[PDB]
Nucleic acid binder design. Structure first.
Ligand SMILES: [Mg+2]
Ligand SMILES: [Mg+2]
Ligand SMILES: [Mg+2]
Ligand SMILES: [Mg+2]
Ligand SMILES: [Mg+2]
Ligand SMILES: [Mg+2]
Ligand SMILES: [Mg+2]
Ligand SMILES: [Mg+2]
Ligand SMILES: [Mg+2]
Ligand SMILES: [Mg+2]
Ligand SMILES: [Mg+2]
Ligand SMILES: [Mg+2]
Lengths: 51, 100, 144, 205, 203
RNA sequence: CCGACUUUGUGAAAUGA
RNA sequence: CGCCCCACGAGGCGCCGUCAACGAGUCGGGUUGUUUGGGAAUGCAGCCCAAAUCGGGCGGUAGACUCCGUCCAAGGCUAAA
RNA sequence: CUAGUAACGGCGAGCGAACCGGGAGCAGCCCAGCUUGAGAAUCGGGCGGCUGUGCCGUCCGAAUUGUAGUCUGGAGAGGCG
């Protein structure tokens, strides 16, 4: 027989975020690239990068 | 004709632009009867004859009871606008047959 | 976020949170607004007063364009003139504002104005907008 | 229905699940239109990619009466007064709209300046190689011809926000603009009642 | 030019001469089959203005149809349903008789394509139309640019699909503004469009 | 069931206008 | 790129004032039925009436008059999105 | 987008478009009618040729109850340049 409440193609697949909120998030991610403790916490082997 | 008043509300309200007179186009003569079509229609008119309600219009006009002439012409044709001019046309036919 | 829906916490509780005595059947009150005049009467005449009936006269083929009057209060007019051309001004010389250039048809009269004169040039004015502009020393120029 | 909520207007009593339209092909139409635009540009090289020229016209409708937009074509009056024949105008990248009417000099000269600008910066290849007839253009400047891309003659949608600074005159202060603005509303209300009494003034006296 | 004369003489349809000739033609028509080949149009002017030409391949076929409305074909007037669909005798067919005649001639005449059809005569029970048919395999039609457009495959059974003059009349395509905006491209197309729930991607 | 319009044309009389 | 050289025909442009021809049981009207958001009637259809050429259809309330805005149906073809 | 709006609905449940505007693409055309009358200038078919999706010649036929050409209202026909 069926499945309960069959899956349908018109789910909400794509969600929308405000353009300014995307930009703010890209700003915070760029800021977080600059902090060596954040990269090292995040899982990159950086003990020999110069600066 | 003359342009708007320039005031947003009131008699002839609107915004002022120097109005312009349109050149004559075709279709402003649209319906202006021509020499040959008048010739054709007038010739065929007596050859065919008059439709029976039009004959009743002739009778009521030559009696002179124009109100009922219009009334029956309206009840045949359908609307006052064409009933009126059908009565005018048939009055024209009666003047052009009592001219002689 | 189905991992958050409270149905998941109601797993194992036989009734899925809808009661044993009064069960959860299809539509025990009717589809939609059924019985506004009859048994949802309390609801409709408590929370939606004025729901039922005609009031007013019909208006065939309304265009919303015919009714377009964007309005601006007097208090916001001075934001429309830039600071430079607020400086390029004195007691006898005042800036001229075309609100129609800003998208406003009528100029309404809410709020304060600075004592500095201003010549607002609109399509429609209120009584009070004029009284406040005159009292501020400006003037009104009606255009369209 | 139950606790305080808007009266629902669900228009889902038909078989709407047979007519749901999903937009998963939106990127696909974007890319297909882009492809079609490239392959039209290469074919109509070196014609302008926006197509023929379009007139500055006013919109209808009190809400947008002041906001100019690109129309459909130049009128016959405009083509004639700019000196470009009817049947030739669509040939060289100029739309023609025989249905518009010119009701203002303000519109006509506005578009005539566009016709003159287009003819000023127009180049036309000869129908053949060596034969350069009237209306053509010289090879030396034909040789640098490019395909302009985008809108090559932009239209300002509203006249620019300009606020100059002027004097406040005494007779300008004396002007009761609201009283003015009520007087013609009164006249518009009374327009029938006035002309009627005028009509029987003539009819009797 | 005689066609103005003859056209006006057919405009006067209640005159004595037209009454005579039209009654006698009505009798002659009533004494023949429903669909009959006729060599030449009885209304040359009307045929011409609709695209008839004295050229090979254009044939004229006279079609008879009964009059009156469409009375519902149900077994005893019994219509099982709610009272609002329960009538029989005052229902009207949503195609005009001109179209019915074209759609009779089109079915019986497979190898030819319907161009137009025009009223010729009428009585209490039967309307007579003349249908202009075109033979599209015939070289004299293949070589006439004004009529090649009818040889392309997309113009098959125009009559059966609602594309002729009568077709557009009963489809309500005679009009453009309001009062006629639902019928473009078709009533069913606009119903589908207005019923499609548009669920945008980023809704 | 019956009434009107329609196919539905021709001329004749008697009563109303 | 090469040979073939484009007219007294057609077109465009300028002027003139003379003509200026345009689709009928079709429009349109009544009534009925269906349909529409279309409401003194949105389309369509049946029956009856049935045209106009200083005219005809519109201007979302039926009606008559005056003026104004607008278009030219009852034949046909036509990609693109 | 207008808009779950004007409207429609035992004005209850409900139902519900359009104009404007922004975009995608944008291309407009041809007939019938008055118009060769020194003269059917048009079309088809059989046969024949060649260069062969056609062209040409000859002979029949269609057609004057009108094929071709000019015209389509934005016009057009005439006359001058
Ligand atoms: Mg519990
Ligand atoms: Mg619960
Ligand atoms: Mg239970
Ligand atoms: Mg309960
Ligand atoms: Mg209980
Ligand atoms: Mg009760
Ligand atoms: Mg269901
Ligand atoms: Mg049905
Ligand atoms: Mg109806
Ligand atoms: Mg078509
Ligand atoms: Mg809203
Ligand atoms: Mg419905």
């Amino acid at each position: 027989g069926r499945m309960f409440a069959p899956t349908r193609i018109w789910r909400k697949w794509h969600r929308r975020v405000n353009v300014r909120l995307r930009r703010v998030a890209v700003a915070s991610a760029l800021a977080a690239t600059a902090v060596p403790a954040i990269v090292t916490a995040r899982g990159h082997r950086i003990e020999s990068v110069p600066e | 004709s003359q342009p708007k008043s320039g005031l947003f509300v009131g008699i002839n309200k609107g915004h002022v632009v120097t109005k312009r007179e349109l050149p004559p186009r075709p279709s402003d003569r649209k319906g202006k009867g021509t020499k040959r079509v008048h010739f054709v229609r007038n010739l065929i008119r007596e050859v065919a004859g008059f439709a029976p309600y039009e004959k009743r219009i002739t009778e009521l006009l030559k009696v002179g009871k124009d109100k009922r002439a219009l009334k029956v012409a309206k009840r045949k044709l359908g609307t006052h606008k064409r009933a009126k001019k059908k009565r005018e046309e048939m009055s024209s036919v009666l003047r052009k047959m009592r001219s002689a | 976020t189905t991992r958050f829906k409270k149905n998941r916490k109601k797993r194992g509780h036989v009734s899925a949170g809808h009661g044993r005595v009064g069960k959860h059947r299809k539509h025990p009150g009717g589809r939609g607004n059924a019985g506004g005049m009859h048994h949802h009467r309390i609801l409709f005449d408590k929370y939606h007063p004025g729901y039922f009936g005609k009031v007013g006269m019909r208006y065939f083929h309304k265009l919303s364009n015919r009714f377009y009057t964007p309005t601006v209060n007097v208090e916001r007019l001075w934001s429309m003139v830039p600071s430079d051309k607020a400086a390029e001004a004195g007691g006898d010389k005042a800036p001229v504002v075309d609100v129609s250039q800003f998208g406003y048809f009528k100029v309404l009269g809410k709020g304060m104005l600075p004592e500095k004169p201003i010549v607002v040039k609109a399509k429609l004015i209120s009584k009070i907008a004029e009284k406040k502009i005159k009292a501020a020393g400006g003037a009104v120029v009606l255009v369209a | 229905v139950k606790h305080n909520n808007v009266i629902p207007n669900g228009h889902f009593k038909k078989h709407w699940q047979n007519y749901v339209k999903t937009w998963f092909n939106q990127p696909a139409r974007k890319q297909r239109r882009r492809i079609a635009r490239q392959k039209k540009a290469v074919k109509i090289f070196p014609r302008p990619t926006s197509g023929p020229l379009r007139p500055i016209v006013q919109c209808q409708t009190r809400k947008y009466n002041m906001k100019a937009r690109a129309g459909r074509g130049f009128t016959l009056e405009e083509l004639k007064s700019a000196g470009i024949p009817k049947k030739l105008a669509p040939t060289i990248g100029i739309s023609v709209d025989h249905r518009r009417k010119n009701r203002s000099l303000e519109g006509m000269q506005s578009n005539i300046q566009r016709l003159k600008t287009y003819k000023a910066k127009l180049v036309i290849f000869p129908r053949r190689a060596r034969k350069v007839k009237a209306g053509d253009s010289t090879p030396e400047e034909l040789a640098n011809a490019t395909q302009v891309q985008g809108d090559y003659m932009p239209i300002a949608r509203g006249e620019k926000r300009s606020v100059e600074v002027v004097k406040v005159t005494e007779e300008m202060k004396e002007f009761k603009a609201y009283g003015k603005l009520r007087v013609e509303r009164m006249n518009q209300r009374q327009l029938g009642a006035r002309q009627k009494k005028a009509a029987e003034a003539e009819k009797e006296e | 030019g005689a066609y103005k004369f003859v056209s006006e003489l057919w405009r006067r349809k209640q005159s004595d001469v037209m009454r005579f000739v039209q009654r006698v033609r009505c009798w002659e028509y009533r004494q023949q089959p429903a669909i009959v080949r006729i060599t030449r149009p009885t209304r040359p002017d009307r045929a011409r203005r609709l695209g008839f030409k004295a050229k090979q391949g254009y044939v004229v076929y006279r079609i008879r149809v009964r009059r009156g409305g469409r009375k519902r074909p149900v077994p005893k007037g019994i219509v099982y349903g709610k009272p609002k669909h329960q009538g029989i005798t005052q229902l009207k067919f949503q195609r005009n008789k001109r179209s019915v005649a074209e759609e009779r001639a089109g079915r019986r005449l497979g190898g030819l394509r319907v161009l137009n059809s025009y009223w010729v005569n009428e009585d209490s029970t039967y309307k007579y139309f003349e249908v202009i048919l075109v033979d599209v395999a015939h070289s004299a039609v293949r070589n006439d640019p004004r009529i090649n457009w009818l040889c392309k495959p997309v113009h098959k059974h125009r009559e059966l699909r609602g594309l002729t003059s009568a077709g557009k009349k009963f489809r309500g395509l005679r009009g453009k503004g309001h009062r006629h905006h639902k019928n473009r491209p078709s009533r069913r197309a606009t119903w589908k469009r207005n019923q499609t729930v548009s669920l945008r991607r980023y809704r």
